[PDB]
Symmetry: C3
Subunit: 458 residues, 3 copies
């Protein structure tokens, strides 16, 4: 009943990239993927994506729910659609034709397109829009009774026709039956090589079959991306849309025009986001937590009541009430327990940290299983690499790891123990003990008067 054809073979030369045009990301996912999301809104019985060069790459990535045909030669949009013939020829119903480079179009607009089509039982329906600078776009010609007669390109347009402000977005709905029919009719009697999807509209004009146009109230929603300038504009519209949705859902933004949140990030209500925060991938933020300017989060989970201050968190888990930063880096596979505190210049990598534990400064915790109520003094380092292998360090509950100490794994610091500040630990420390591995202080009276820094020597 409903079928979809997505054109993704284009030659994105103005992109100046080796990556197939439609694979370029917009807020987390590729333009193609956004098109797949709006397309799904019309519940197409079949979905066929036409890819061109590097065809393998596009497929090798998003093998999403969609058939895949290849267009080895650049013979135009008509030929691209013709490549879906083997799969859609014969079937009766409505077929959506959309480009993979117009990611701003919405599922809602696509639904209205079909409804508008089936409604007037048109043979073909053109998704159109209006602008005051239609230069370059095919124009939409209608009769005094406002019926879509045909589409006129800029090069063929009469002076009088250049005045038309309604343009063709390049998105269409065709009755699948007539469509492939008209595609062979143009292909064979073409007296030329390349044919275009708009050539089918020319045929319906020759035969008088009903063709209509649904207009998009927002012209900017029809943007076709051809270069990194339109790319940025796409990014900008999608950003406003994502952020508008969160604000309506109860999230505060100091500046939603400069906050970068990917398409799939989930944010509980009452969260507060300062300007210039970055949320990427599969990220979740719980209720009332606070994200300050600079925070950067990727594929992570943050609980409720947390305060993330200018810090970078990657593939990690952060419980409720956790405070992080400023300038902290939480690396892959880390888990911070409830009320944990990670202060400035602290790095946590592949480590579980129990609740209420704190590492407030200039610290590195890697490959450690850390307990609850632990204390890391400023300067502490967990050494877990010898140039070939990594080793694990186990730290019990309530351990007091003295400042500037060097913990050389594999070792265990038992519960309630303490490592003297400035110590190098090479062996296990039993529970309730203290470990000290540092030289004893020695004073040399008057010796400083004999060194470069002394006032007497400058």
């Amino acid at each position: 009943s409903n079928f979809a054809i997505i054109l993704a073979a284009g030659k994105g030369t103005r992109m100046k990239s080796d990556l197939p045009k439609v694979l370029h990301k917009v807020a987390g996912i590729s333009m193609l993927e956004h098109v797949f999301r709006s397309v799904g809104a019309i519940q197409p019985e079949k979905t066929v994506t036409v890819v061109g060069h590097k065809a393998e790459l596009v497929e090798e990535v998003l093998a999403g729910q969609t058939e895949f045909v290849t267009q080895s030669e650049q013979l135009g949009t008509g030929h691209a659609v013709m490549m879906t013939e083997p799969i859609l020829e014969g079937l009766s119903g409505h077929t959506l034709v959309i480009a993979g480079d117009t990611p701003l179009i919405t599922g809602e607009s696509l639904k209205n397109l079909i409804d508008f089509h089936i409604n007037h039982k048109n043979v073909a329906t053109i998704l159109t829009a209006e602008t005051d600078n239609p230069f370059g776009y095919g124009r939409i010609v209608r009769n005094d009774n406002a019926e879509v007669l045909r589409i006129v390109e800029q090069k063929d347009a009469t002076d009088f026709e250049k005045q038309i402000k309604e343009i063709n977005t390049g998105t269409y709905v065709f009755d699948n039956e007539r469509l492939f029919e008209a595609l062979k009719n143009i292909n064979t009697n073409n007296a030329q090589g390349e044919y275009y999807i708009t050539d089918v509209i020319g045929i319906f004009r020759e035969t008088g079959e009903k063709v209509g146009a649904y207009t998009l109230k927002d012209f900017d929603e029809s943007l076709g991306v051809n270069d990194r300038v339109a790319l940025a504009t796409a990014e900008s519209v999608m950003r406003r849309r994502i952020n508008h949705k969160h604000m309506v859902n109860g999230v505060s933004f100091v500046n939603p025009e400069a906050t970068y949140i990917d398409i799939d990030v989930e944010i509980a209500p009452e969260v507060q986001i300062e300007a210039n925060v970055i949320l990427k991938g599969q990220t979740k933020i719980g209720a009332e937590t606070v994200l300050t300017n600079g925070t950067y989060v990727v594929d992570s989970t943050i609980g409720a009541g947390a305060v993330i201050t200018n810090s970078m968190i990657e593939e990690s888990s952060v419980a409720d009430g956790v405070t992080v930063g400023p300038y902290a880096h939480i690396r892959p596979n880390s888990s911070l327990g409830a009320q944990v505190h990670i202060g400035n210049f602290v790095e946590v990598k592949g480590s579980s940290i129990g609740e209420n534990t704190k590492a407030g400064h200039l610290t590195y915790i890697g490959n450690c299983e850390v307990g609850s109520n632990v204390n890391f003094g400023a300067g502490t380092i967990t050494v877990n690499y010898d140039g070939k292998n990594k080793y694990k360090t186990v730290i019990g509950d309530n351990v007091f790891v003295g400042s500037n100490s060097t913990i050389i794994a594999p070792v265990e610091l038992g519960d309630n123990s303490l490592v003297g500040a400035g110590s190098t630990i090479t062996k296990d420390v039993p529970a309730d003990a203290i470990a000290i591995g540092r030289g004893r202080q020695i004073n040399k009276d008057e010796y400083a008067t004999r060194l470069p820094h002394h006032p007497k020597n400058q």
Copy 2:
């Protein structure tokens, strides 16, 4: 002679917050507080704020110069004003009626509103504005001679009336006498429960008493905040206004559209601010200092000629010529003396630092009284916590604190002394002495050929 009534009881359901709508901040202070600031511009003999739910909270915070009446039930704006009757009934004069959720209105606009009122000796004056999308707003109906006849809501508006572009901002000036009179007249003969402030305009129409409207030249100044989307817009307008004011006052902004400066921050002329800088609360910046992208300052004082590079400064004092950052954190109750230098990855907490002293890297200084011309080598740590209590460290003038040393308080390093790099200091170091607490170096020939990192073993 002049009285003010501020409506702050509203049910901000679209805000999706537990915090009373008007308490949500906009550039440092709550919307209510901005309204109190514009209201003060008309020197009201009395100011009464009507609060609703959580009434205690709004009051418990800004017990600012203003009477407080409570509206326990949601019976409309008319009933809310009726709650101020005990306090304003009888008094003669002009009474301003304003919402606590329209924080962009200015004191200047409010003054022009009253003057326009007293001028034409109107009984009531409507603060209006113009827009091309008046859908939803009450319209302002005037006669062929441009006199305000009445206000018409959207639901009652005739097709012909929907065309009116002048809308009601919900701000008004009433002759206090007639106002409460008309409020009882509607209340009793209401034949309904809730009555609205606009019902009083209906009565003056019935009686023919003169009603006028002062139009705001800037429509965006009338924004009523109902959700976090308008919240963000408020933040955006107020930000442009604050920043415009500083630029006119001689401050350079690389991008004033993305620089966040609270309402009360003071900035001397010739200061240079890069994009994405944050100034909050009671912050002061002296002449010619430079703030680079990322700098974040809260309730602090910075002198003239300073250079703050991507650093966070909180509740502290920073003298003239000080250089901080990149990535430095100056925490509560710190004071940096003239020409002091705090470099990358350095934390200073509750400490006074004398002039020309330097801590250029990976350093923590907490609870210290530090002298002038001191030098902290990279890696230094002042240890001031044992898990229960904090201790103080006193460091004289010209001390050279060697890199990677660990200073365990409570201790004193006397003038011109030096602590050997990599030392753990547990006792006082007399003036002019040197202290060393580190193991002596030992070399083991060929031993490395026997370890994982060696080329021979990989």
Copy 3:
């Protein structure tokens, strides 16, 4: 044949700066310098800049290709041009008159101005533009046949004339001969002190000599900067222009409206720039490298395939495939070899680092010649200062510098050697050896039950 006169003596009082108005920067260089760049587009046989106060300063800086005359008194634009008389009087040809405070005008617009001039063989040509708020600007009066009759200031304009939307940008092309002629004719018979460049247009009106106006299609291109508000606007237009140019050239921007790239930065295609990145001065970025939010680069070279994560790089060289950050600081005169890795909280100053070497954390490397495949454990510090002099450290290939070690220069760590974590190195370490300078660990059973942090004591 073509001559240029740049007016740079103005009294930029609304700037509130001690620095001559035209010296204020816009995207890396001064407004004056941007004007010199557009001016060069018309290949002027001679270029003369009129400077006023602090005349020495403007010259003492950009002694660029241009004659320099001084205007000691503020007698108007006419007098300023009159100061170029000694140098341009007599010569025949077209003379461009432009202000040093209109930096957005383009060389292309300037070329079109001259062509439009020489074309109609006009005596004088006025560079004009159109806007809907011409209040304050001199208006352009034309006859029913659209010929430039004269310029009318706002104060003299008739009501009917205030309607004119075409305004004078203050940029002109005059036939050098008549120009100085008309300048003496006004100067002597002036019956007043100060004369203005627009007075020459008045004379051509008296004599009927042909005067024309070339209109700028973009009004915003004519901005005259007088205060830091227009300054910011200039910065904003120039930023969009620079960034538009890179996007067209194949560079991706997450938000080109909030990315700050100086006028002279070079960026290879396929580079990806996140929002809020800063590129200043002579900076070069190679193909496909990635710059994340916060990165700040000044006068540096970055190769291809690099990933710079929220880090600051100054006057340094960075090879291909290098990864830096987050929160790393690469200081002046550093060179990172191919595939080098500098992680979080690491500082590199005046040091060469060989390929594949890594310093992933909390590390300071200053004044070192470091080899290839070296490894710096977290916490390492190279000590190179004694309060008076700096010393160099030489580190061979494949050295393993243990965590928390303190390397006191001048020393050498030979190839494949290893420094034990937590060691203080005061002497050379031969190749293939290991060096250890740390106290041995000692455990005291039960001692912790006797300290403040222990659960038993709280």
